[PDB]
Ligand SMILES: Cc1cc2nc3c(=O)[nH]c(=O)nc-3n(C[C@H](O)[C@H](O)[C@H](O)COP(=O)(O)OP(=O)(O)OC[C@H]3O[C@@H](n4cnc5c(N)ncnc54)[C@H](O)[C@@H]3O)c2cc1C
């Protein structure tokens with residue numbers, strides 16, 4: 001029995017714990033299958049895993065001491081460091097004493113008469129708790145790339161989502177399936193170290209340079225000295241990536257101008273930035289979208305010295321969402337021990353003991369095959385848990401037609417359950433969204449303790465409104481889930497919390 005159960009010990013889990021335990025004095029336990037805190041940063045330790053967000057923003061805001069303390073080696077932070085960082089947050093606030101590691105949750109069924117949650121582990125522990133905090137993140141189970149004959153393969157088959165330790169590249173032919181962000185990081189990291197790399201590319205994507213430089217003692221002092229301002233600007237921005245968000249329209253300058261603005265962002269680095277700090281309409285207007293793409297196509301053709309290769313790396317679709325970030329990805333394809341296989345015009349059909357076979361019957365002989373093939377959507381982490389609310393409805397069935405929430409946090413027919421980095425949340429840097437959501441959830445359970453209430457849920461009506469509020473803003477953009485940003489997200493939930501949780505049925509003891 002607990003005031004609250006937390007599922008997860010990543011960013012959202014760790015803070016949920018700290019806040020509910022130490023700031024609101026609640027009786028709380030946190031669960032994670034992982035042996036250590038960190039979430040995705042414990043699980044994903046492949047070559048080149050790295051924040052998209054800058055080092056000084058990809059962290060908690062609420063411990064001012066730890067900010068002055070924080071190591072800031074590079075502009076962006078490597079997986080080990082993030083894990084060291086969260087590990088050290090656990091150390092400082094002693095949170096592990098209230099985390100059971102190696103302990104998956106199987107089921108959670110809301111008890112309607114005790115107004116609390118029945119949570120049963122995979123081990124078969126039944127714990128009771130008034131409140132359910134799910135911090136499962138946005139990246140669910142990996143994609144299992146159904147490839148005929150994966151069983152026959154007798155070399156190393158590794159998946160980025162479960163990267164083993166003690167992996168050696170030297171002297172080996174290595175295949176990489178996937179050229180989204182994980183696979184670009186993998187390929188950039190390893191192309192230098194292997195005998196031969198084959199990239200199996202299903203869909204060429206746009207990548208810009210990240211520009212992950214070491215941070216001088218002065219650079220780091222400039223950050224620390226003005227850290228309070230840094231955050232206030234994060235809270236007063238759409239993306240919370242510390243960017244001079246632009247309102248300048250793209251086609252409202254010269255071609256020679258536009259060029260030079262893109263070359264500035266490009267020299268600086270970062271995908272958000274190229275897309276939101278150059279101009280203000282790149283995600284909304286098509287001409288602008290096209291202009292942004294053609295800038296990158298141009299870059300691709302300059303860097304990639306072999307035109308036929310440059311061709312295969314060039315996206316073909318009409319409009320471009322967020323570009324990936326890289327650390328010399330396009331450069332990779334110039335080298336003599338890298339080859340690109342367009343696996344949409346020449347797919348993988350079979351896989352024998354020692355090779356991947358594509359459509360034209362070429363046998364790609366590999367010692368090692370790496371799946372960098374991506375994760376399921378937000379709801380997959382939920383749908384994969386036995387979660388049942390009112391009238392024994394399981395989240396599986398309630399969301400069978402796409403995920404839904406109120407404010408990204410609360411679910412209809414699903415009481416005392418509060419989601420962190422949950423679906424229909426804002427598009428922005430992770431740590432600020434998580435802070436925002438945890439603080440808000442904590443205050444509401446605070447309100448609940450003080451107004452002696454014992455049951456909170458969002459209406460079906462509140463939810464659709466919110467589902468609508470996302471579509472209206474969404475359809476104002478090209479992205480053919482909640483946009484309009486963090487600043488306006490934080491407004492929206494303040495408009496709710498200040499109006500006695502409009503759309504939440506607060507039920508009383
Ligand atoms: C390499 C990499 C770089 C990234 N860079 C950025 C970035 O720059 N900016 C950004 O905004 N985001 C980034 N992300 C994503 C984002 O910041 C992380 O996904 C975020 O830290 C998630 O924190 P979380 O605690 O909400 O969820 P997670 O960290 O995914 O933690 C969820 C935890 O819950 C546990 N869990 C789930 N289901 C169950 C269950 N049934 N039982 C028990 N435990 C369960 C899991 O073990 C997991 O540890 C990145 C992700 C990766 C992999």
Ligand SMILES: NC(=O)C1=CN([C@@H]2O[C@H](COP(=O)(O)OP(=O)(O)OC[C@H]3O[C@@H](n4cnc5c(N)ncnc54)[C@H](O)[C@@H]3O)[C@@H](O)[C@H]2O)C=CC1
Pocket residue numbers: 050051052053139143145146177178179180181182183200201202203324325343372373374375
């Ligand atoms: N930029 C960053 O710092 C990072 C961001 N992320 C987050 O995760 C998201 C992307 O996840 P990723 O793991 O990078 O990959 P992804 O989610 O883009 O994976 C899909 C890719 O895998 C390949 N693929 C999948 N199934 C295939 C099949 N059957 N045949 C051939 N190829 C196939 C395709 O090339 C495809 O582009 C990002 O949008 C971001 O939110 C994750 C890691 C690093």
